[model samples]
Target: KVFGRCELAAAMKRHGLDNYRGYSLGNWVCAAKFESNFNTQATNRNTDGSTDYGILQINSRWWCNDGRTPGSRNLCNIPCSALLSSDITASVNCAKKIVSDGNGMNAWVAWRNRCKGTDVQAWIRGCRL
Candidate 1:
């Protein structure tokens, strides 16, 4: 909740996520917008009996724990609630690892549904990154 678009962009750049894997800031920017509205404390209950955690809506099936599920790949190996970052540091690191491990920004359904092929430049329009 503490981040606006610009702040999120700055943080992403600092995390080495600016142009990771040919996914530009545009993808990350748009992903966060449609994905979580820049919310540090976001969760979604997926229709397939799984929950998504945090800003990028990472899934309980692989990344973090959602408590409703008993088993996980647990690659991020953190609690589900841990994605609710007051300062976004942990969430950023968690997301960074998740992106590299999986389908880039396609990890979030929000990205595919909204951000894909969209004009995301405005997402970082005023960001000083």
Candidate 2:
């Protein structure tokens, strides 16, 4: 499991994610909700035959080792299982590598589905930050 919204915001801040690449902390927190409902153990098998891993849904095809694939870029150098753990340091860092590589929130499907252009404060509403 991961944190509640406020707790997530605080942690994301601690990780310097508040204004990463000009994307607001709200965006990160909101996207993670849709991506995994803030659950680090989230995983889904995509139609492309790769698994989406963790809260940020880092892909197994190129982002992590699924133990059955080859040529995995794995730029974060962390295994796919690490992203599924409660310790999200690896997943969060991997997410940074993606957005920092200039993809931004556009890289995450959840962001496009829900968090796009909407006031995201509701995701953190009434929670103690």
Candidate 3:
């Protein structure tokens, strides 16, 4: 499921990510743009063999257990497959946990590189709250 920009913003807000951990809806929406391009089923395999799964691209090495990443922490205690679902609840919950664990939204390289210090507000400029 590829979400429209405002649709993604609206969904994140519905999940209470608008200002989760001091990050705004714009920040979340922007990160989603670069991380997975608002696609619910996106996945990327890192050089380290850790695969990032789903819209927010939650990583296998730290967040979800894939049984392929050696000694994964599985901090979110979710099967990596769950993150790949079009239903984003599992991915979003793990993302919230990631931010809550002191890593903040900076946990996502896409957020740091593309969204950080940028005009993130433009990501949701035309969205109705």
Taking the tens digit of each residue's C-alpha lDDT, what string does model 1 give over 54-109? Answer: 77777788877667765556678888788877666667777788778658777767
Clashes of each: 0, 0, 0
User: Model 3, residue 113: what's the lDDT?
Assistant: 90
List RMSD in Å for every model shown: 1.8, 1.5, 1.0
* Model 3 Cα lDDT, one tens digit per residue, 7-101: 88888888889888999889999998899989988999999999999889999988999999887789999999998787778988889999998
Which pairs clash in model 1? none
Worst 10 residues of 3 by lDDT: 83-92
- Per-residue alpha-carbon lDDT of candidate 2 for residues 1-129, written as tens digits (9 for 90 to 100): 877888888778788887788888889999998998888899898876778888888887778888755555677787789999887788878888888776678889889888989998777677665
TM-score for each candidate, following the candidate numbering: 0.86, 0.90, 0.95
The TM-score between candidate 3 and the true structure equals 0.95
Q: Which candidate is the best by lDDT?
A: 3
Better of 2 and 3 by lDDT: 3
Off by over 4 Å in 2: none
Q: What are the runs in model 1 whose C-alpha is more than 4 Å off?
A: none
